[model samples]
Target: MNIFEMLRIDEGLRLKIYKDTEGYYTIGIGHLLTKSPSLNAAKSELDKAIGRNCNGVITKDEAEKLFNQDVDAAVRGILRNAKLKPVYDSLDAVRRCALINMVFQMGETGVAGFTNSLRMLQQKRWDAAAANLAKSRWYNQTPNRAKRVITTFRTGTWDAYK
Candidate 1:
């Protein structure tokens, strides 16, 4: 599957605010509610977009729209990261999804910190690419997701997604 569907399963939609793993208030497909614009303002915007009071809750369609925008942000972030953009077009869809998933979680700068892994990816050394990512604190923090992503890199198949 594409990055969008892959991320939907990973991000887990929510209508109302809930604490993320790190305790930041998040809602509607990993949209963190702590931005400087203010949570009330965020809700007000959602309310306006949905054309209803909404009471700080978002509709399913609104969640999808926000997630789509976030995915585009991830795309632009990857394109902006010099290390990722050059090799991006050549990667298969499954591998692309894995890369986008990592970017989605960590941002382009964070993912760019994996120098060895990105180098391996460019060299088309799948095993070493996967191995290098396993060395990160990111891996330790989210071992399950990391393992799946590593498998996607190594196998270049949606089997990891399954």
Candidate 2:
């Protein structure tokens, strides 16, 4: 499905630390190393990902490694989440990728809050699902990315960099 290619295009890989759209300390394909537990722990993990104590830049190889790890976490978080798992399981691969994209940007905890949105998805009310999801803070935070994902929900198509 070229999921990695799609995500790389959508995320725009970065090697050095920078503030993300929401002003979080991010690097390596949107890895939010901004206090996952605390800033120290986050830095430690970042060090491990980059294999250094303190470094501003990372190799393309290092960035790809972190991207895969982040993708793995996002996928597991969605699939293991009790409420989302059922709906996640039933969705086709295309929409499944969109859910993973949602988890990547917002986390499953945030995605889980879309209770009404999930119901429409469960019922196969695709357009309703899109509308409901569009009425969320996540959509507001990243309108362009959210718009692409919502279109997928609405019509089951690859609306991103396909």
Candidate 3:
């Protein structure tokens, strides 16, 4: 069986959102909703259904499918967005994966906001890209993660600290 299927079995699928041990808004196979834009669209649908004052529940399979679709669409967005694809296409696989991971976290348009960094990447100026990323707000917000991407940019390797 696939890893997702195994994860499903291990997680104990539920149809409605519930608080986990940490008291967070979660649904499906533990898909957390608070501060998570990835599921905002689905959450809106859920809200609409609940707004009708009806039982709002989804099948496990449906939830799983929706999650996959959301992730796939986001990845596609990163691949197609004008701001990212040019640099994305120019990088090697490891660096490309790093970019993908960043895009996944910040969204394609969000990544585009890294104007200086993106430009450095497009010019194949790795050191400049690393320096630019190191000074951005994104780096400030997530310093450790920023370091990993910066290291990849500076070294042309993907040995991101786990």
Candidate 4:
């Protein structure tokens, strides 16, 4: 899609989508989400809250409740374009699904950026997967998210340690 097409906001929160004074489009709950001193600062805050789709850490049932019509559609779409073909070839469904979530969140571009780790995954090497995960630029920039994604990759489950 587009650069901002995947941006998600929860329901019931009123969001403003407007062209800023700098001629850039901004979308957010109230005016505080994006009008910070720098876009990086705003994005750091926004990224943390995007861990769940919407309405917080939704149970599987709650996810069904909230996105009944679109849930399957979304995953099917992700599966169609999954760039982690090597990962899919070896991992269990649970592990694949968790990694798929990370890929969906990070996009293949970020995943591809972890070249060494991707190769390790291709070789079915778990330690390499974890190691590559630790040294990536993405991990360096988003430590908590990196930890969560790596844990899910290894354990085949999502953990809410935050």
Off by over 4 Å in 2: 35-45
Residue-by-residue lDDT tens digits, candidate 3, 1-162: 332432343345678866554455566665554643434554665665334322346676666765675456556887778888788788876677667656645667788888888888879898888888887777886677568667867776645533
lDDT winner, 2 or 4: 2
Write the residue-wise lDDT of candidate 2 on 32-83 in tens digits: 8874535566567678767787655677888888888889998888879997
lDDT (CA) for every model shown? Answer: 0.80, 0.80, 0.65, 0.49
**Candidate 2 weakest ten by summed lDDT:** 35-44
Compose the digit string of candidate 1's lDDT tens values, residues 27-130: 79877656434667667655665577877787888888878888899899888777889767768777888888988888888888888888788788998888
Lowest lDDT sum, 10 consecutive residues, model 1, at 33-42
lDDT of 1: 0.80
Q: Give all candidate RMSDs, comma-separated.
A: 2.8, 2.4, 6.8, 10.5
**Candidate of highest TM-score:** 2
Which residue pairs in model 1 clash with each other?
Answer: none
What lDDT score is found at residue 79 in candidate 4? 54
Model 4 segments beyond 4 Å from truth? Answer: 1-83, 157-162
TM-score of 2: 0.89
Clash count, predicted structure 1: 0
